[PDB]
């Protein structure tokens, strides 16, 4: 009568749905990664401490706005908040830092010399688009300046332009030398420095701008865990980010953000070149028709699950929580369905960066994820992952699917994995066990990067290397036993799966043990 | 390449997801029924004409507010708009009328003049919780009193009272090892006349209030097609609505709204007694934890699909469209997932009743539904429905499963069903074909009520009765051919499935024909 | 294009059949146990050496015929032949001895004083059955003596009497006391001391006769590995055999032979009480209609597979090989299908006991088994075994299933299992891996008894117990590596699965390692 175990036993997906039970409580463990955008609502050390307690795993830094100095301070505050819990290694939670690039963005300028001024646009009205820098800070109801000098080369008569998250829509009725005559289709309030989308158009802006270069270099300096690369259209875009990160940033994970039609069409080559994917639904839902976004989301999650690569579901997941302490029913549904789709990580943007309820948003993601994780039809999911995964000679892959199989068979409270680089734990995660994967590492970057994968609950061991290797291994296993008991994942007498290797070093995971919790 | 046919052919659900394609266009046909709440934004004949054109199948009248005179005028306008298209029988769309009851409620507020003296709160104040009808109608600082009597017997200390339907949370504590105490907590504001809830309880209130009685009788007078019965807790509640509708309203469909923990717990008995179910997520999401609503939604949709009974997914599906001309990404997701879950109908409330963009909301539900319908994994869905449906001697059930099988085998443009009561078309809908079900009927109520079922595209035959019954049957088949050709569901030479019976009258459907479009 | 790996990957059983390929050669390893009845054709040390080389695993002694002296000599010769290979422990094959009881048989007397003398019986002719021992030696064309005293009390008028594996049929025409008068329906060559079947009748003979007692006692003295108990009707029959074997024979395996209606009806209780089952098709096909035998065979194999208990398919598998050096196509089919059904063991009776081609019969069973083992649809088989096997907390179960899963993932050349009692190896066999299970034991009886399980290739470790337990464990693993390499199951660099425990003694298997062959 716990964790949807009645639904778990169903012979059909339909019967599985019929058995979902609001009176069947989830396990304590939450498997889905929580990524939070840090901004003025969430930047203080004190707020960041509560974020972490509420379930934040990754701190996203959005490089659309702010200076390096601002970002360096945020990173410092994230690290201050994280390390305030280092005193108890059993309770310490690793926290990753993600750099989200600006990328090839298009923005308007200032309404009447102000950052906050708005004008109204009425349905049918003429609005002139200018690239004359004179009108940079002088936008209004009749004249709009935007920052893309090549707009006129790529737009035509009858093109649609979207302003402010696609809320304002324009139709190019007349095209000039370095200006556009448009008609307001969908009107509304136009404010300053709003995002512009050209869904029809082949936009000519660089994959990695000069600003993106400086930002990525800063990320290397700041020891960031991962890059969320905005507007990835093709594999060569990924390779440009990778080259910029260089040898010095070779271990930083590249997550390609898919937010245009091109990114979708060339998904396979992008996935192959990336460490994972973000379904960047914001821009994606402006670039392609809104009614198609769920198709692209489920296609990308599916392909990532098949590749064993991390996938993030991002944007407007709990949007109304910017202003309200409770989400709408669509938002509750969206979070649950991203989990059920297969997403490794769910994300908050404005909900944590600037909203009135950042901690409530985090808490809500935690609550929903855990409910949805119990509602997964693992019986079908594990059968299909097995059938679709290549037979290989890799001992670690064999140990991992065997451990996952074993975890289903004895209903284990956890899979404990010792890992240096994270790979052994990643290989377990790919097979989607119900039980949490406690990944024990001494590598602090490994501990942080592990949040990219569903189910991986990283624990940073800070006990010194014990001389007898077998004792050092047992120490780390016992550490995980202590964490799992303290977090209420399991109790003494329960069975857990333990994954180790036959010698120290990396690349030797080959041992699976079914052990009672002491 | 069309209607996700590549995804359709996948051997696994995971590969099916991998194959979902934003460049695979849907068919013209949309199967999911659209229910729109009518109010000041959508009440005019002229707006209602556009609502119908945009895809409105059912007009919901919410009896929480408004007089019978107001409602009678709305119903008149709906009928005026609908009948403006009666001139072309080929293109005429039937439009149903649904009466949504107030049901047993509570009504918060004493100070109520357009903009009330705010709830806001007051994390411990004097309002105050009373075991009496004494100090109710009194205010001296900031208080707002309700309309319900006996709270006790079915009560426990420290419970919650969600004012303005979940916009405000409450702390209310009585017993309480010290006197007969009260308490107040976290607030916001108030519009005018709110509500109170009592979680996990068995609430005693009448199923059918005196007001409900008058509105149900009004519904019979106004020839409504269906009743959405509010706050159904048990089968005897449904039987009370049924008795109130009486012999005169015996053909009016009763849709039980599942609104609370009891309604979820007693779901099976409610379902058996009802004509269908509404997943009333608004109240449900206040009554149970918000993070559990997706569980109850998927449980009820699944059980309804299993029973072959209509299920409506309701509340906040495109909520942000009240103020904005585009939905959020969570809202697009929610609509698509309700359809993928298997909902027969999707609903709009404030989006069409009071919002700034009613037609855009309707259109968006139409676009999403049709995209999601192509993304259904029919291969698994039809296998599971067959495996789980009882073998019976019923010739109609066997014919209707034969018709769906045949429709999958020849990739038919439609399933044409002659039906008097709708039952034969309902029986086809239960098996979830990809192709639209063109239900040809002379019964105008049948034509309207058929919108409750996924894929039933009702057509009201006006043509006079031909002399030879076989010729009158062929006339109605040809009528459906003409509708399908006009709507672009199919062209001359395409194959369709045709269902008829061996003699006139209801209950004799036993003939399935695979026929070319003339 | 080996081991039917193309057929292995099919999404359906039908496609799997379509992909079966005569040009796809099997591995080396043969999993199905081969049981050979030893008799005059096969009992010389020299022939027995070749039977072992040809693949004989179990030596069956049929106690319907022959003296203790004769059987003691056979057993001595089996042991002489087996031990001639003891010189190389790497190549030594353990060989089990099985005692097959006479049980409650009914046999005829001697034809005209001789045990080889044969009357040809006429169709339609009269034959008198007597219990008068005057005629017990004087059996002829018109007088046949049976050894069943209670014949007349259990066989009514009109009853069918079958003689000589059912080939001769007689109808009870005249029912008396001490005798019966019958007409030969199916005439033929009647010989001496032929089996009699009374399919209608409730035969009241003891489960364990006085001869059976002398025989089982002899089995205990002779250190037999297993008893094939004839004509088991009920669980109390198994308990009887178990009590007869007593403390002294407590480790001898009881295999209940199912060969009448009652034993099929009471199958579940029999199975629960036994160590395994023989499908004793000979008698079964006379006792129940011949056309039902395949139903009872597939039912019993299925239930045994589900229980993880050994099942033997027995009787007439290659019958024509008694006289011919090649089998019929029905016989090739029968062998292949018993393996495909999921039989742990196949058996030879007259083919090895008295036939002209015993080594050819053994060889043929080995060739067909190995071809059929490759044709198994493991994808469905392993999925179904998993779904149907209880979730338990048993660490060994979890390890055994983990092992089989891992073995499928890395296409391992073997699963190596250290076992004292055999149980850990039995637990792996239950889940049906494609790869052989090399069971390393120091227990010689364990090594012999392990032939009862599909895929278990037992190896008897002779090496002395090392002082360091970890070194003793590694020594046994290495021994299995050497066996596998020598038998061509795998080569250096290939991967294998290794199962061990955390401490010495039975019941602690919890460790699964994926190890390269040194
Ligand atoms: O996942 P990775 O990076 O391959 O690391 C797993 C490694 O961790 C271990 O369990 C322990 O290694 P250390 O003692 O070096 O920390 C190895 O046996 C194994 O090869
Ligand atoms: O779906 P229902 O109400 O059972 O109606 C189906 C009936 O319609 C028919 O096809 C036509 O009947 P009518 O000619 O009386 O309309 C019958 O043969 C069949 O029994
Ligand atoms: O199959 P069984 O009878 O439980 O034996 C398996 C046992 O063999 C071992 O691997 C080795 O035990 P021994 O050293 O006592 O032979 C144990 O760790 C394990 O419990
Ligand atoms: Mg973006
Ligand atoms: Mg027999």
From Swiss-Prot, chains A, B, C:
Enzyme kind, highest EC tier: transferase
Post-translational modification: ISGylated.
Annotated residues for binding of Mg(2+): 259, 283
Pathway(s) of this molecule: Carbohydrate degradation; glycolysis; pyruvate from D-glyceraldehyde 3-phosphate: step 5/5
Stored Gene3D superfamilies: Phosphoenolpyruvate-binding domains, PK beta-barrel domain-like, Pyruvate kinase, C-terminal domain
N6-acetyllysine PTM sites in chain numbering: 49, 76, 153, 253, 257, 292, 309, 420, 462
Cofactor: Mg(2+); K(+)
Site (Transition state stabilizer): 257
Chain positions found as S-nitrosocysteine: 410-411
Protein residues bound to ATP: 62-65, 107, 194
Effect of residue 395 to A: Significant reduction in hydroxylation and in PKM-mediated transcriptional activity of HIF1A
Modified sites of kind 4-hydroxyproline: 390, 395
GO CC annotation: cilium; collagen-containing extracellular matrix; cytoplasm; cytosol; extracellular exosome; extracellular region; extracellular vesicle; ficolin-1-rich granule lumen
Enzyme nomenclature, EC number: 2.7.1.40, 2.7.11.1, 2.7.10.2
Statement: the UniProt record of this protein carries the keyword Nucleus: yes
Modified residue annotations for Phosphoserine: 24, 84, 87, 114
GO BP: canonical glycolysis; cellular response to insulin stimulus; glycolytic process; positive regulation of cytoplasmic translation; positive regulation of sprouting angiogenesis; positive regulation of transcription by RNA polymerase II; programmed cell death
Leader peptide range in chain numbering: none
Similarity comment text for this entry: Belongs to the pyruvate kinase family.
PANTHER family: PYRUVATE KINASE
Note: There are 4 isozymes of pyruvate kinase in mammals (L, R, M1, M2) encoded by 2 different genes: PKLR and PKM. The L and R isozymes are generated from the PKLR by differential splicing of RNA; the M1 and M2 forms are produced from the PKM gene by differential splicing. L type is major isozyme in the liver, R is found in red cells, M1 is the main form in muscle, heart and brain, and M2 is found in early fetal tissues as well as in most cancer cells.
Descriptive protein name: Pyruvate kinase PKM
Organism for this UniProt entry: Homo sapiens (Human)
UniProt gene name: PKM
């Amino acid at each position: 009568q716990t964790q949807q175990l009645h639904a778990a036993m169903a012979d059909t997906f339909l019967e599985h749905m019929c058995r979902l039970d609001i009176d069947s409580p989830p396990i304590t463990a939450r498997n889905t990664g929580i990524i939070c955008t840090i901004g003025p609502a969430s930047r203080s050390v004190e707020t960041l401490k509560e974020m972490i307690k509420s379930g934040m795993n990754v701190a996203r830094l959005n490089f659309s706005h702010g200076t390096h100095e601002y970002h360096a301070e945020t990173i410092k505050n994230v690290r201050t908040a994280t390390e305030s819990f280092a005193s108890d290694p059993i309770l310490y939670r690793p926290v990753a830092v993600a750099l989200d690039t600006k990328g090839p963005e298009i923005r308007t300028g200032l309404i009447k010399g102000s950052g906050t001024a708005e004008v109204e646009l009425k349905k049918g009205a003429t609005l002139k688009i200018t690239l004359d820098n004179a009108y940079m800070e002088k936008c209004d109801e009749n004249i709009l300046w935007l920052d893309y000098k090549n707009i006129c080369k790529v737009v035509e008569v009858g093109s649609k332009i979207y302003v402010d998250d696609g809320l304002i829509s324009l139709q190019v009725k007349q095209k000039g030398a370095d200006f556009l005559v448009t008609e307001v289709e969908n009107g509304g309030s136009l404010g300053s420095k709003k995002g512009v989308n050209l869904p029809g158009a082949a936009v000519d802006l660089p994959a990695v701008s000069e600003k993106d270069i400086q930002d990525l270099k800063f990320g290397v300096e700041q020891d960031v865990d991962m890059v969320f690369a905005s507007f990835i259209r093709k594999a060569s875009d990924v390779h440009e980010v990778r080259k910029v990160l260089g040898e010095k940033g070779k271990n930083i994970k590249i997550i390609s953000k898919i937010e245009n039609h091109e990114g979708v069409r060339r998904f396979d080559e992008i996935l192959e070149a990336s460490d994972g994917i973000m379904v960047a639904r914001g821009d994606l839902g402006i670039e392609i028709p809104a009614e198609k976004v769920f198709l692209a989301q489920k296609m990308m999650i599916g392909r990532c699950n098949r590749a064993g690569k991390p996938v993030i579901c991002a944007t407007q997941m709990l949007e109304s929580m910017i202003k309200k302490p409770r989400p709408t029913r669509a938002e509750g549904s969206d979070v649950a369905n991203a989990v059920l789709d297969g997403a490794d990580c769910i994300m908050l943007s404005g909900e944590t960066a600037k909203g009135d309820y950042p901690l409530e948003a985090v808490r809500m993601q935690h609550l929903i994820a855990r409910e949805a994780e119990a509602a997964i039809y693992h019986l079908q999911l594990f059968e299909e992952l097995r059938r679709l995964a290549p037979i290989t000679s890799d001992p670690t892959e064999a140990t991992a699917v065997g451990a996952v199989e074993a975890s289903f068979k004895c209903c284990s409270g956890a899979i404990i994995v010792l890992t240096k680089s994270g790979r052994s734990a990643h290989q377990v995660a790919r097979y989607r066990p119900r039980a949490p994967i406690i990944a024990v590492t001494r590598n602090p970057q490994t501990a942080r990067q592990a949040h990219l994968y569903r189910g991986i609950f990283p624990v940073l061991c800070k006990d010194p290397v014990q001389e007898a290797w077998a004792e050092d291994v047992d120490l780390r296993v016992n550490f995980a036993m202590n964490v799992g008991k303290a977090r209420g994942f399991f109790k003494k007498g329960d069975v857990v799966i333990v994954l180790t290797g036959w010698r120290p070093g990396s690349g030797f995971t080959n041992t699976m043990r079914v052990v009672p919790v002491p």
